[PDB]
Amino acid sequence: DSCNSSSSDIIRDLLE
Amino acid sequence: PKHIIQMTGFKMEEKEALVKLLLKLDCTFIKSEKYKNCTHLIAERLCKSEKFLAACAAGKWILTKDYIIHSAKSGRWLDETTYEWGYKIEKDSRYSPQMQSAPKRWREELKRTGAPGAFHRWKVVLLVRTDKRSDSLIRVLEAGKANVILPKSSPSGITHVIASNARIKAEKEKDNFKAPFYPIQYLGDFLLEKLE
Ligand SMILES: [Cl-]
Ligand SMILES: [Cl-]
Ligand SMILES: [Cl-]
Ligand SMILES: [Mg+2]
């Protein structure tokens, strides 16, 4: 759901 | 003694069931993707969400969903100890013993030393790739009581330069800063993996 979409890995998100 | 609750890692239906149980207890629940200074983070699993890393950096309680289920059934917030991520270590696991124990390690270490956060006295310049937001990284750093130096603030006393592609940058470019360069991953490793 769009209202429940926090990242489970913010380090990975910044690497790629 | 306050109970400011956030949750990380639960799908919508699981989260609905848990928030319904919070109505049986005096507490605050903060709905946000961001870390919002919860006293108790309920985590579905060990992870690297903003909430999980920030809660570690501030030495908060990071607990299993059973903490909510059992407290609601009892009509009263229970002792957190046996519900903590880190209370029991799985020797056969994809997660290292350090990462499995990280919430307990930081909670106990900050109480021992008196420091308010895992990054207290750090003064950090972030050089994050210009196409992505550094906002989650900043909120984790600030949860750990690091001072994130904005471009308009003086660079006096910088302790860390945390940089996208730090391992690629030229020495000439690193020479624009007195402090050493660290990759983005250092932040997660310092909290979850490094043996101090
Ligand atoms: Cl407590
Ligand atoms: Cl939420
Ligand atoms: Cl790097
Ligand atoms: Mg303290």
Author numbering:
A (entry chain C): 437 to 452
B (entry chain A): 6 to 201
Task: Give the published text.
Isothermal titration calorimetry (ITC) experiments indicated that SLF1tBRCT interacts strongly with a Rad18 peptide containing phosphorylated Ser442 and Ser444 (Rad18-2P), with a KD of 15 nM. The strong and specific Rad18-2P-SLF1tBRCT interaction enabled us to crystalize their complex and determine the structure to a resolution of 1.75 Å. Two SLF1tBRCT molecules were found in the asymmetric unit. Rad18 residues 437 to 452 and 436 to 451 were fitted into these densities on SLF1tBRCT molecules 1 and 2, respectively, revealing mostly identical structures for the two Rad18-2P peptides. The Rad18 peptide N-terminal half including the phosphoserines adopts an extended conformation and interacts with BRCT 1, its C-terminal half forms an α-helix and interacts primarily with BRCT 2. The Rad18-2P-SLF1tBRCT interface is the largest among tBRCT-ligand peptide structures reported to date, burying 1600 Å2 of surface area. Our structure revealed that phosphoserines 442 and 444 (pS442 and pS444) in Rad18 form distinct interactions with SLF1tBRCT. The pS442 side chain is completely buried at the Rad18-SLF1 interface. Its phosphate group forms polar interactions with the SLF1 Thr13 and Lys56 side chains and the Gly14 main chain carbonyl. In contrast, the pS444 side chain is mostly exposed to solvent. Its phosphate group forms polar interactions with the SLF1 Arg50 side chain in complex 2 in the crystal. The α-helix is stabilized by the pS444-Arg448 interaction and a Ser443-Asp449 hydrogen bond.
